[PDB]
Amino acid sequence: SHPEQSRHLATAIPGPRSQALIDRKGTAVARGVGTTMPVYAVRAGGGIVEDVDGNRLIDLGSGIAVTTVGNSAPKVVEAVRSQVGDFTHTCFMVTPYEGYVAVCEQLNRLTPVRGDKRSALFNSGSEAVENAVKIARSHTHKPAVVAFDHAYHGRTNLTMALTAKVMPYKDGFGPFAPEIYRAPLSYPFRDAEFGKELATDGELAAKRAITVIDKQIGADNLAAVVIEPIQGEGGFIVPADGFLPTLLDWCRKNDVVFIADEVQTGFARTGAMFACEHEGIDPDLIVTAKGIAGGLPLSAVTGRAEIMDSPHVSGLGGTYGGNPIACAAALATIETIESEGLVARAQQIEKIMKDRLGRLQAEDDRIGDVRGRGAMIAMELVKAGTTEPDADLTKALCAGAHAAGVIVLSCGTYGNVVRFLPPLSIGDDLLNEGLDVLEEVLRG
Amino acid sequence: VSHPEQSRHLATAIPGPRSQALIDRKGTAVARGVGTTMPVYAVRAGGGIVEDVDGNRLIDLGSGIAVTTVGNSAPKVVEAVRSQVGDFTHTCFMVTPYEGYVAVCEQLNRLTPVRGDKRSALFNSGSEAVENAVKIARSHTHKPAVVAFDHAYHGRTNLTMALTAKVMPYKDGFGPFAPEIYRAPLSYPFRDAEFGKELATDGELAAKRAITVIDKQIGADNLAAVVIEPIQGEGGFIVPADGFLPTLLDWCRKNDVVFIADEVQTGFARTGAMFACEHEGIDPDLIVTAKGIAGGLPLSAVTGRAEIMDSPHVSGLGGTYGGNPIACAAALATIETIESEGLVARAQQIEKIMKDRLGRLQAEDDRIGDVRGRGAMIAMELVKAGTTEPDADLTKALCAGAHAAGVIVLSCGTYGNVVRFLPPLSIGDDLLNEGLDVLEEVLRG
């Protein structure tokens, strides 16, 4: 039974029980673990998170794009409750189980990779990115990996290296994994300053990136190009059409592994099962996590078999990876997406969000850009009439929204992107109410 | 919760038909690099048994590589998970926090061998937790280098692969690796004895040799941290001579270097103490935990002195899933189970049984060169008779024979010649003795 599907302010935010927990957190948990919301969760589902003080908050974050099928989705709940009674863990590398194999089979069926495929399962998106890189290096016997401006790939030493922004992800945590290189990205809103055409000519932006890659790395030294189809933490940046196709074509001609990092965009989030579908991109490897298992810790790499099978037996794995409870949850998640038509639901949500935010942009020129696909939509805030970022306004907006019982996140290289990641279980009325709150706060 | 029948049972050949069908599916769906030890597919597990799809019931002497210490599907863990999942599966602690995360951190702070004011942070895997302990140490010290030891195992990410000593299969072809990672010599009494019997058990002098390497080849003013397992796990259940860890700790404290105890495998009752640092009264600066922490659910942690832990800036630590609320509920239940079922004492009982059985076997069979470990982390090292030459061939044959007779048993070691025993603390004496009987019978044959 989920919380009542209405916003409710029982107390000030934070309320007293949340504040008590904030004080406990401060004396038990390292300060490096930051928290966005000043409330403590007790129950969640549909479009709501209910806190320890009885407030019900509208969820426009889905736990950073994780609870796409909704928190405590009925199929996930049942799958976890059943499996936990059978076994919690055998370690797949010790005693295997059907759940792991079935999830790999489903990934192989569902992903935009073409031909014969194999998969492997881990826990976090960072681990899965690490394994995609291991796999590419093993297959190609080449060292280098290139990632892009505004990219985010995780918090391990190598995924920090792959990540572009230092504060807070990398600052003081190096030195970082070697032979990682940076290439320029298609970012239409900011590329427009140098030519309206370059803001829309994705093939040309890819050629700029290729020249960097060719000259500064060389295909014969390059294992892999890793890219998010839409940059997530970097600001919900959607590349100009032609950028991803041209990159993939270059990789295919130069024996370089094209790795799509769909940790955030994957599993119905962008109004397709995978965001690579929007331009018909068939990557060599695809990394998945977040929405894959309805909140349970699971991640994966799926890819062309000949690439995936290069690592030697026992060269991939980890103790917990592909946990049987998580696998049960992932199968339940897939079944939920397919049975409830959640890809189409993300499309419906895109229409509502782009309509509402577009009308807002029309009334407020501090909104420089509205962008994204499906239920991954954002607005970038700027000093009116310019592309100068306004992170101060972004912080103010988010703080005001939180005070009014709405969970909303920011992101961006310049800290000035307000993003929207509602779960696909949110109803239209709560989605529209959340956006109403943002409008009211922005007006004041 | 209803665990499988607590008896070994061979319903079919190993593998049976249903397992063979699954082996065939695995081969066409799963990357070959994900290896599997047992040729059987699990359906249910608990107590001291794993039951497979063909109805075979195998004796579990692996606990999923030291994870299901409290037993598979432990009653309190099952209850906690089932309760939590109905409330919420995930909010991201970094977005909307929840009490379970805080409560696990408070419990770690209370139970760990770190002294003074403490803080914790939660992740998913042991590799992630090691990575975090390193990030924390670097942030706090503003020094770059980290030293790990011969025979060390710390994980499968780029940096934890760097920290890990053995290349096959952990590192091979997966570099280049994270920079400013260095290697120092380890106390390994069995193999050190060839070079001096007295020296081999002098852990203080062993530490002094490692400190000389560290001083000369790195320098304290360039070194953020020393990371070490109290008993090396994948490297062979190597127990350092007494005085090694205390002397290393003392040097670190004198030289502003973070001493990181990697208790991913040794932690949470496994060694007959809550934490293995307790056996010599070591108080590390940071301690890494995972595996047994949450009864099989994916969770890991770093706990440490508050002034070190709080060095990273706000939002510098975390990850999307870390400290998942279902895993936190399982951790709280795991801790409660260890206390309520007296599992630390149970680990001590199992130590006695295993060391007595294996010591008798060693007296009768000169191919057993060494029997070592603590608690329910015990191993025997197999050698050519009369020597310390490793016998990986015998190890493999012994493990294969055991698997065919319905016993899950693992190997390890730098030279592939260590048979390890990691029974769950929920195993009955009779099944544990039966599992050991199987190993004996296979070894005789």
PDB file of N, CA and C in Angstrom, chain B residues 12-53:
ATOM      1  N   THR B  12      20.876 -36.757  -8.085  1.00  0.00           N
ATOM      2  CA  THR B  12      21.348 -36.992  -9.449  1.00  0.00           C
ATOM      3  C   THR B  12      22.877 -36.971  -9.485  1.00  0.00           C
ATOM      4  N   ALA B  13      23.429 -37.251 -10.662  1.00  0.00           N
ATOM      5  CA  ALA B  13      24.818 -36.908 -10.956  1.00  0.00           C
ATOM      6  C   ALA B  13      24.977 -35.389 -10.844  1.00  0.00           C
ATOM      7  N   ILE B  14      26.217 -34.942 -10.664  1.00  0.00           N
ATOM      8  CA  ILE B  14      26.548 -33.522 -10.542  1.00  0.00           C
ATOM      9  C   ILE B  14      27.386 -33.141 -11.757  1.00  0.00           C
ATOM     10  N   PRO B  15      26.835 -32.313 -12.670  1.00  0.00           N
ATOM     11  CA  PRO B  15      25.509 -31.675 -12.676  1.00  0.00           C
ATOM     12  C   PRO B  15      24.370 -32.593 -13.089  1.00  0.00           C
ATOM     13  N   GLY B  16      23.162 -32.285 -12.621  1.00  0.00           N
ATOM     14  CA  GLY B  16      21.978 -33.005 -13.074  1.00  0.00           C
ATOM     15  C   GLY B  16      21.434 -32.352 -14.323  1.00  0.00           C
ATOM     16  N   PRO B  17      20.319 -32.868 -14.856  1.00  0.00           N
ATOM     17  CA  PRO B  17      19.749 -32.349 -16.098  1.00  0.00           C
ATOM     18  C   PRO B  17      19.305 -30.897 -16.066  1.00  0.00           C
ATOM     19  N   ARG B  18      18.643 -30.471 -14.988  1.00  0.00           N
ATOM     20  CA  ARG B  18      18.179 -29.085 -14.920  1.00  0.00           C
ATOM     21  C   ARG B  18      19.363 -28.117 -14.823  1.00  0.00           C
ATOM     22  N   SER B  19      20.375 -28.489 -14.047  1.00  0.00           N
ATOM     23  CA  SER B  19      21.615 -27.688 -14.003  1.00  0.00           C
ATOM     24  C   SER B  19      22.318 -27.654 -15.365  1.00  0.00           C
ATOM     25  N   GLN B  20      22.356 -28.783 -16.077  1.00  0.00           N
ATOM     26  CA  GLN B  20      22.984 -28.797 -17.397  1.00  0.00           C
ATOM     27  C   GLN B  20      22.267 -27.857 -18.362  1.00  0.00           C
ATOM     28  N   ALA B  21      20.938 -27.838 -18.337  1.00  0.00           N
ATOM     29  CA  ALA B  21      20.172 -26.913 -19.165  1.00  0.00           C
ATOM     30  C   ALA B  21      20.541 -25.452 -18.862  1.00  0.00           C
ATOM     31  N   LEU B  22      20.675 -25.140 -17.588  1.00  0.00           N
ATOM     32  CA  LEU B  22      21.124 -23.806 -17.156  1.00  0.00           C
ATOM     33  C   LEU B  22      22.578 -23.504 -17.521  1.00  0.00           C
ATOM     34  N   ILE B  23      23.465 -24.494 -17.407  1.00  0.00           N
ATOM     35  CA  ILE B  23      24.872 -24.319 -17.872  1.00  0.00           C
ATOM     36  C   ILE B  23      24.873 -23.920 -19.364  1.00  0.00           C
ATOM     37  N   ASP B  24      24.035 -24.580 -20.149  1.00  0.00           N
ATOM     38  CA  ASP B  24      23.953 -24.299 -21.588  1.00  0.00           C
ATOM     39  C   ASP B  24      23.438 -22.900 -21.863  1.00  0.00           C
ATOM     40  N   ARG B  25      22.407 -22.487 -21.132  1.00  0.00           N
ATOM     41  CA  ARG B  25      21.908 -21.105 -21.214  1.00  0.00           C
ATOM     42  C   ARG B  25      22.951 -20.073 -20.814  1.00  0.00           C
ATOM     43  N   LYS B  26      23.673 -20.348 -19.729  1.00  0.00           N
ATOM     44  CA  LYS B  26      24.712 -19.438 -19.261  1.00  0.00           C
ATOM     45  C   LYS B  26      25.757 -19.237 -20.354  1.00  0.00           C
ATOM     46  N   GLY B  27      26.167 -20.315 -21.008  1.00  0.00           N
ATOM     47  CA  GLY B  27      27.193 -20.214 -22.040  1.00  0.00           C
ATOM     48  C   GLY B  27      26.824 -19.364 -23.232  1.00  0.00           C
ATOM     49  N   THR B  28      25.541 -19.219 -23.533  1.00  0.00           N
ATOM     50  CA  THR B  28      25.164 -18.378 -24.654  1.00  0.00           C
ATOM     51  C   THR B  28      24.648 -17.002 -24.269  1.00  0.00           C
ATOM     52  N   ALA B  29      24.557 -16.698 -22.968  1.00  0.00           N
ATOM     53  CA  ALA B  29      24.059 -15.387 -22.530  1.00  0.00           C
ATOM     54  C   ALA B  29      25.026 -14.576 -21.709  1.00  0.00           C
ATOM     55  N   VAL B  30      25.897 -15.242 -20.968  1.00  0.00           N
ATOM     56  CA  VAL B  30      26.807 -14.606 -20.003  1.00  0.00           C
ATOM     57  C   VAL B  30      28.221 -14.600 -20.555  1.00  0.00           C
ATOM     58  N   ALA B  31      28.925 -13.474 -20.405  1.00  0.00           N
ATOM     59  CA  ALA B  31      30.317 -13.374 -20.820  1.00  0.00           C
ATOM     60  C   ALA B  31      31.177 -14.466 -20.157  1.00  0.00           C
ATOM     61  N   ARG B  32      32.093 -15.048 -20.925  1.00  0.00           N
ATOM     62  CA  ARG B  32      32.876 -16.166 -20.398  1.00  0.00           C
ATOM     63  C   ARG B  32      33.751 -15.768 -19.202  1.00  0.00           C
ATOM     64  N   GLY B  33      34.081 -14.476 -19.110  1.00  0.00           N
ATOM     65  CA  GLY B  33      34.899 -14.010 -18.022  1.00  0.00           C
ATOM     66  C   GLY B  33      34.274 -14.125 -16.641  1.00  0.00           C
ATOM     67  N   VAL B  34      32.947 -14.256 -16.595  1.00  0.00           N
ATOM     68  CA  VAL B  34      32.264 -14.554 -15.337  1.00  0.00           C
ATOM     69  C   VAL B  34      32.354 -16.072 -15.113  1.00  0.00           C
ATOM     70  N   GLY B  35      33.312 -16.491 -14.306  1.00  0.00           N
ATOM     71  CA  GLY B  35      33.530 -17.915 -14.088  1.00  0.00           C
ATOM     72  C   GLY B  35      32.560 -18.444 -13.048  1.00  0.00           C
ATOM     73  N   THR B  36      32.312 -19.748 -13.066  1.00  0.00           N
ATOM     74  CA  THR B  36      31.508 -20.390 -12.010  1.00  0.00           C
ATOM     75  C   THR B  36      32.285 -21.591 -11.454  1.00  0.00           C
ATOM     76  N   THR B  37      32.293 -21.735 -10.142  1.00  0.00           N
ATOM     77  CA  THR B  37      32.984 -22.842  -9.499  1.00  0.00           C
ATOM     78  C   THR B  37      32.184 -24.160  -9.521  1.00  0.00           C
ATOM     79  N   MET B  38      30.925 -24.103  -9.084  1.00  0.00           N
ATOM     80  CA  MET B  38      30.080 -25.288  -8.983  1.00  0.00           C
ATOM     81  C   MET B  38      29.269 -25.493 -10.246  1.00  0.00           C
ATOM     82  N   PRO B  39      29.214 -26.732 -10.728  1.00  0.00           N
ATOM     83  CA  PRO B  39      28.365 -27.026 -11.879  1.00  0.00           C
ATOM     84  C   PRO B  39      26.891 -27.249 -11.515  1.00  0.00           C
ATOM     85  N   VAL B  40      26.373 -26.573 -10.503  1.00  0.00           N
ATOM     86  CA  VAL B  40      24.970 -26.752 -10.134  1.00  0.00           C
ATOM     87  C   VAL B  40      24.368 -25.383  -9.939  1.00  0.00           C
ATOM     88  N   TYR B  41      23.066 -25.292 -10.212  1.00  0.00           N
ATOM     89  CA  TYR B  41      22.291 -24.066 -10.107  1.00  0.00           C
ATOM     90  C   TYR B  41      21.416 -24.090  -8.844  1.00  0.00           C
ATOM     91  N   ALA B  42      21.555 -23.058  -8.014  1.00  0.00           N
ATOM     92  CA  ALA B  42      20.876 -23.002  -6.699  1.00  0.00           C
ATOM     93  C   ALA B  42      19.408 -22.629  -6.799  1.00  0.00           C
ATOM     94  N   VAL B  43      18.571 -23.252  -5.952  1.00  0.00           N
ATOM     95  CA  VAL B  43      17.150 -22.897  -5.806  1.00  0.00           C
ATOM     96  C   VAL B  43      16.821 -22.347  -4.406  1.00  0.00           C
ATOM     97  N   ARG B  44      17.440 -22.922  -3.371  1.00  0.00           N
ATOM     98  CA  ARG B  44      17.225 -22.513  -1.976  1.00  0.00           C
ATOM     99  C   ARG B  44      18.477 -22.830  -1.153  1.00  0.00           C
ATOM    100  N   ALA B  45      18.665 -22.107  -0.050  1.00  0.00           N
ATOM    101  CA  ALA B  45      19.832 -22.272   0.799  1.00  0.00           C
ATOM    102  C   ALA B  45      19.534 -21.827   2.222  1.00  0.00           C
ATOM    103  N   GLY B  46      20.208 -22.445   3.180  1.00  0.00           N
ATOM    104  CA  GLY B  46      20.056 -22.085   4.579  1.00  0.00           C
ATOM    105  C   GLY B  46      20.732 -23.092   5.472  1.00  0.00           C
ATOM    106  N   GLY B  47      21.018 -22.691   6.711  1.00  0.00           N
ATOM    107  CA  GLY B  47      21.724 -23.557   7.656  1.00  0.00           C
ATOM    108  C   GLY B  47      23.110 -23.830   7.120  1.00  0.00           C
ATOM    109  N   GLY B  48      23.379 -25.093   6.803  1.00  0.00           N
ATOM    110  CA  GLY B  48      24.609 -25.495   6.138  1.00  0.00           C
ATOM    111  C   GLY B  48      24.473 -26.102   4.748  1.00  0.00           C
ATOM    112  N   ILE B  49      23.367 -25.805   4.067  1.00  0.00           N
ATOM    113  CA  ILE B  49      23.020 -26.442   2.806  1.00  0.00           C
ATOM    114  C   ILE B  49      22.698 -25.461   1.659  1.00  0.00           C
ATOM    115  N   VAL B  50      23.100 -25.835   0.441  1.00  0.00           N
ATOM    116  CA  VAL B  50      22.551 -25.243  -0.785  1.00  0.00           C
ATOM    117  C   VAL B  50      21.846 -26.346  -1.537  1.00  0.00           C
ATOM    118  N   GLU B  51      20.573 -26.118  -1.862  1.00  0.00           N
ATOM    119  CA  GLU B  51      19.796 -27.093  -2.642  1.00  0.00           C
ATOM    120  C   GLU B  51      19.739 -26.616  -4.071  1.00  0.00           C
ATOM    121  N   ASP B  52      19.932 -27.538  -5.014  1.00  0.00           N
ATOM    122  CA  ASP B  52      20.006 -27.198  -6.443  1.00  0.00           C
ATOM    123  C   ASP B  52      18.715 -27.543  -7.174  1.00  0.00           C
ATOM    124  N   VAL B  53      18.638 -27.179  -8.450  1.00  0.00           N
ATOM    125  CA  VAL B  53      17.426 -27.337  -9.266  1.00  0.00           C
ATOM    126  C   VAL B  53      17.035 -28.805  -9.507  1.00  0.00           C
TER     127      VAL B  53
END
